Design a protein around this nucleic acid. Structure first.
Ligand SMILES: Nc1ncnc2c1ncn2[C@@H]1O[C@H](CSCC[C@H](N)C(=O)O)[C@@H](O)[C@H]1O
Lengths: 93, 84, 321, 76, 107, 98, 107, 93, 84, 98
DNA sequence: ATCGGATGTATATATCTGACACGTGCCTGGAGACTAGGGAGTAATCCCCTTGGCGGTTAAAACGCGGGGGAGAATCCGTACGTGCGTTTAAGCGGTGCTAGAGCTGTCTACGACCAATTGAGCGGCCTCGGCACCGGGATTCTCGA
DNA sequence: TCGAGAATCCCGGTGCCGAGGCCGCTCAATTGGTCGTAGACAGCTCTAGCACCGCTTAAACGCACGTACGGATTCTCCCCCGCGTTTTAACCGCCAAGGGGATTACTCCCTAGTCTCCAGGCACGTGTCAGATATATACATCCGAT
């Protein structure tokens, strides 16, 4: 049964940000569970931000406000910048 | 025209922090408490107001609602009953 | 009535009304004439050699006749040492370079004689002290062939500081808000006339109004090399558009700023090539580290330098194993 | 014929070229021989900012001559 | 049509297809706007990049070329902002930051 | 000789009084001006509903009297009876806020 | 076809129709069983019954016949398990429990 | 417009458990928010329970397990007894 | 057959609690810390195991699997990375 | 005269040993018997995946490590160095668990 | 203070090993290309309610002064806890064996979304009084210096 | 080993404004169907968890001993409390302005949905290198002797 994971994607971001090093399987499943946990946090805050304003969509702006709430300070500024950079690179394609 | 309040944290006066501390049940309060409690209250209000203003500015509003402060407190795990 | 003292060299004479100028918390006209007289005293040794004569503590702000007596003493002195200058005796040459506290209170003199109401500056910006850019001058080493520019000069005080203190060919200053640029063109003209009054040398410089992201200003900053900003509250879009503007700078160009565009633990790798952190070396200074008026803890105004060799050795280190 | 590629940090690499091929092909060979990205590099010679669809002879740079290398941030 | 993956349009390494499927089949809201999974995958890929960069630094400082969980704990407990985001969490086989109180070392 | 309570029992009388009543302790307009002064930094020209600064005040007094309960337990733990900044910083370092 | 309400079918007071509509429209799952809102409105009615009983006792001890918020705070703090359920919340205009620590009363 | 509340149902349960006692408007809003918060906790744990097994429905089993998880001890026993009594009283009729 | 365990809370030894406190940064340990920490560990394991056993009683299973313990700890706030 | 270390430095060598290392500091099989004893009270004849015992172990010992950090801060606050059961009870009362 | 003996820990090298790293079918999930509907953007308009500004009152805040009591410092005692050491013990490893149960798959039926028609539950708005807020003053219970 | 000033409490008395009951009126709950599918269940498979054995040895237990430290004690200074006078800003009440929230109408773009293709990623298999372990010897240091 295909138990999907974020193994290969965390691996690709590792081979980008560190071209030498690799990641052991326990630390592989730690970053798997971390990506799952930040996903569930941001999607939970986006769901509550969509329900609190009587909307019915998770648009890009709700994920931006979720990242502004959850991540502290400079991580919020950097993740907001990288997110809106990726969404403006996506829409002009 | 325009205005900005220079240093307005001293409105949480020394008898106010004294009354709050007497509510919690302290018997005697050292004199260096009051600066520390003004700092603690400033950090707590900065966190709740930062999340409340984010919840508002998401909704395209310019009035911080009472629901926005209630959601900003429910976000940090300090749920507030009485305002919705 | 009036109160006048001419230059120690003989420029257009310094004029003052008999009504009292009161401006700020710390800036009065009596202290102004006191500090100006003392710095004209410290510039020429013969002046404090001649005017030690019998004027002690007993002088007060509003009592104007002792001010008239002392300034008449100084006026007789100025004319008489001009007659001592008219002989074979050589004076101190006008085209020498000034001191540090001399430029400090010459800039505070322009601060006095141009801006009277600074809280009208509140209509929205802060103050940059001159000891900050003084320790920057202690840090930055510069030549004649480069160009100095600060972006968002406000009243333009540091423009006059660099233009009279050090030696770029063309110093700029820019300001977009109407009130401090409004006062800054007058600061430019009055600083020109006070440089005529003191007679100390200063190079080519200007104070302008505009948005420094415009299409002229893009290649204009792509021309220069020395840039100063106070980027605590420019915003995100201003700083990113300025980053992709400073990407077109030559070798050795230097930036000084409050909020650093790249954090000083930067290491470049295949994810953040688009950032300006691949171009700059980031060093840290040590200023007076004050500003307890708003938020300021001990923080330095970090120096970036355009160093396109770290990107080159990264690209050649790509093929190591 | 010969080409010189000057880097701004003061190094040159001498390479085997054809003037008939495009400069996009020789900058691809610059990628294969040094690792410099195609989007990130730009090569100039006497105020002439090159274009990838044009060749070496189309901008009239001759044998044993040098192209200056400078870099721009890629973006998207 | 030449199939270009939606993560490759954005230039992210994290998938936005899988993020879009999880946003739909997790029931966060009824409709999921198309600009949201690319934004969310950019944020996840950024946070993975920051924890992996600090983890690689903490592993190379320990003269190892492989990220062990201890290097992950040494990454996220040293950076104060990742320590605030990951405050509640226990990283397994993680260890503790070596910090002993200065009262205990004898004069 | 005037009548004067010994130092310590007007405090306990204040404790019984402020514990048995439920009104707000900070004056309402200084807290409203403090909330506006802190909200000045995030978005300018923000309006506040009156119940919003009331909710901020109920939350801030409930947080501060819970912190003072914790700091009183710390000050009693150090065999003292006076709360001090060491005590407040200890309660916040234990609850996970510093 | 007599419209007999589901809130009355189960002998509850809480609106099983409204609880069912909130379970559907609130996006908790893609379908909500019929056994769900009867159970949930029963649990809500039981918790409201226990809180209101203890608040009524606490207001009767203060010889008042209107439950004000202070009686709710006395109800949720005097019981142990309602205090464990409501441990995070701050019931506004509620006050604290009256107790002074044993080192502070005079001796 | 119509802003729904649990005001009248809390009022009915108060009239059941204390037939002479009333509830002030601020304590009315506090019990309104308490019912809303307990409903959001139980439905949140029920949605997580129905998702963690790759199910799709909030049955009565999921609400029973959520009430067993959130409320402590004796409240959990009495609440699941009240709930199973009410679901049997519903399904028999 | 079967086995029924009487008490294994004395199996968390005194050197085990010494090693745990040495990880925390504790230099001297009073002699009652061992009994108090056995009590504290028993309370914590009762909470996590009660929630995990409820999570596995719901799924009609009879093995408390690692996802059940991880979900119990994610419920009580102590989120656990490294088990799924 | 045998070589004896002044009481208080094998503790510091133990701290520097265990703080830099990532073992599980409780032995595994006593913890398995403890987890099965505690789980017999809730559902009889349960089984445990081995990863679930390791998850319960890593969680319980990381909670106990953080508790001993808060306890050591409590004991240092009381001008002592020795953690005592009133220090654990204070740390668990400040954290919000009793 | 200075100085070795013993100890511990770090640094260096050779070894095995198994767990990471990468290549292979493959399959299913993601991309793509229409299709329809409603959710959301946008504009316009009503009007609630939020900010800002008078003054009058006065309770509360600020300041200052004795002064007692509590924090802290210094001293002393003994005992409880660290440290080795040797003596016990039970954890760990490394195998084997079983079957219980997780897990996957294959029907299939009950069940819940969906939709339309029907109606009364519950909403806002509005009188209506009574529980409590304020108050006045006296009895009770303190707290303290006698 | 208590009377006296003084808060606090209690009890009767007055007034008010918020709880509390009543009433049209929507519109959301109910009922009655239909249909797609998800969950229940049966059955088979096959991982893996429990159980058991014995060997090894790291670790736990016990124990005596010495010493640092916790706790009690006494003392001393300062500092924070209680009180009284001044003072000031909160607060209440009232006033108007107008900003923006809330609502409705309209319209179209964006996204669910669906059907088809195809390649991205996953389980699996296999080489081989980073690290773990063991050993062997240099540095860091701890601590008692002089
Ligand atoms: N587009 C723009 N062009 C010019 N100035 C700008 C600008 N945007 C902001 N500014 C100015 O940047 C200034 C920041 S304050 C800097 C003060 C001054 N440079 C000094 O060093 O003393 C403000 O005056 C603000 O008006």
């Amino acid at each position: 049964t295909r138990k999907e994971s974020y193994a290969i994607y965390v691996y690709k971001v590792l081979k980008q940000v560190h071209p030498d090093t690799g990641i052991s399987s326990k630390a592989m499943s730690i970053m798997n569970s971390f990506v799952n946990d930040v996903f569930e946090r941001i999607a939970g805050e986006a769901s509550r931000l969509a329900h609190y304003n009587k909307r019915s969509t998770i648009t890009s702006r709700e994920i931006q406000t979720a990242v502004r709430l959850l991540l502290p300070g400079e991580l919020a500024k950097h993740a907001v910048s990288e997110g809106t950079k990726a969404v403006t690179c996506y829409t002009s394609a | 025209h325009r205005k900005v309040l220079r240093d307005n944290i001293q409105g949480i006066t020394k008898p106010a922090i004294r009354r709050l501390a007497r509510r919690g049940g302290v018997k005697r309060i050292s004199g260096l408490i009051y600066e520390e409690t003004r700092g603690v209250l400033k950090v707590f209000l900065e966190n709740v107001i930062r999340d409340a203003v984010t919840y508002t500015e998401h909704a395209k509003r310019k009035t911080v609602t009472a629901m926005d402060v209630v959601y900003a407190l429910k976000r940090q795990g300090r749920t507030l009953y009485g305002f919705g | 009535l009036e109160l006048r003292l001419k230059s120690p060299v003989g420029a257009e004479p310094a004029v003052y009304p008999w009504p009292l100028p009161v401006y700020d918390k710390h800036h009065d006209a009596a202290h102004e004439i006191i500090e100006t007289i003392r710095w004209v005293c410290e510039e020429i040794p013969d002046l404090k050699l001649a005017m030690e004569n019998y004027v002690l503590i007993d002088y007060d702000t509003k009592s104007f006749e002792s001010m008239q007596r002392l300034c008449d003493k100084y006026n007789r002195a100025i004319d008489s040492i001009h007659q001592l200058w008219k002989g074979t005796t050589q004076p101190m040459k006008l085209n020498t370079r000034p001191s540090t506290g001399l430029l400090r209170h010459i800039l505070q003199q322009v601060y006095n004689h141009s801006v009277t109401d600074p809280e009208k500056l509140n209509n929205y910006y802060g103050e940059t002290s001159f000891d900050l850019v003084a320790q920057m001058i202690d840090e930055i080493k510069m030549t004649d062939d480069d160009l100095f520019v600060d972006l968002g000069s406000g009243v333009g005080q540091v423009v006059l500081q660099v233009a009279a203190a050090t030696n770029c060919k063309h110093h700029y200053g820019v300001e977009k808000a109407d009130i401090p640029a409004k006062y800054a063109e007058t600061m430019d003209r009055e600083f020109r006339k006070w440089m005529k009054w003191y007679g100390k040398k200063h190079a080519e410089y200007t104070l302008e109004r505009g948005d420094f992201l415009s299409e002229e200003w893009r290649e204009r900053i792509a021309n220069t090399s020395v840039i100063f900003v106070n980027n605590f509250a420019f915003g995100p879009e201003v700083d990113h558009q300025l980053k992709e503007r400073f990407a077109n700078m030559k070798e050795g160009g230097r930036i000084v700023s409050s909020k650093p565009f790249a954090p000083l633990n930067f290491r470049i790798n295949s994810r953040n090539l688009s950032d300006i952190g691949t171009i700059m070396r980031v060093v840290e200074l040590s200023p007076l580290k004050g500003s307890v008026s708003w938020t300021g803890k001990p923080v330095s105004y970090y120096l970036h330098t355009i160093d396109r060799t770290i990107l080159e050795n990264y690209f050649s280190s790509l093929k190591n194993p | 014929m010969q080409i010189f590629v000057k880097t701004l940090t003061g190094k040159t690499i001498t390479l085997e070229v054809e003037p008939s091929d495009t400069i996009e092909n020789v900058k691809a060979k610059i990628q294969d021989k040094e690792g410099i990205p195609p989007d990130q590099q730009r090569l100039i010679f006497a105020g002439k900012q090159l274009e990838d669809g044009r060749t070496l002879s189309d901008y009239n740079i001759q044998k044993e001559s040098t192209l200056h290398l400078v870099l721009r941030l890629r973006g998207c | 049509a030449k199939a270009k993956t939606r993560s490759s349009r954005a230039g992210l390494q994290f998938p936005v297809g899988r993020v879009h499927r999880l946003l739909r089949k997790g029931n966060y809201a009824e409709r999921v706007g198309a600009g949201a999974p690319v934004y969310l995958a950019a944020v996840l890929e950024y946070l993975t990049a920051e924890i992996l960069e600090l983890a690689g630094n903490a592993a190379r400082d320990n003269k190892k070329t492989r990220i062990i969980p201890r290097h992950l704990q040494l990454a996220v407990r040293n950076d104060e902002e990742l320590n605030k985001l990951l405050g509640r969490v226990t990283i397994a086989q993680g260890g503790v930051l070596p910090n002993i109180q200065s009262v205990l070392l004898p004069k | 000789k005037p009548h004067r309570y010994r130092p310590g029992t007007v405090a306990l009388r204040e404790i019984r009084r402020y514990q048995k009543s439920t009104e707000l302790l900070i004056r309402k307009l200084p807290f409203q001006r403090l909330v506006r002064e802190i909200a000045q930094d995030f978005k300018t020209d923000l309006r506040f509903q009156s119940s919003a600064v009331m909710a901020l005040q109920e939350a801030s007094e409930a947080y501060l009297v819970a912190l003072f309960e914790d700091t009183n337990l710390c000050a009693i733990h150090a065999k003292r009876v006076t709360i001090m900044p060491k005590d407040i910083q200890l309660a916040r370092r234990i609850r996970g806020e510093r």
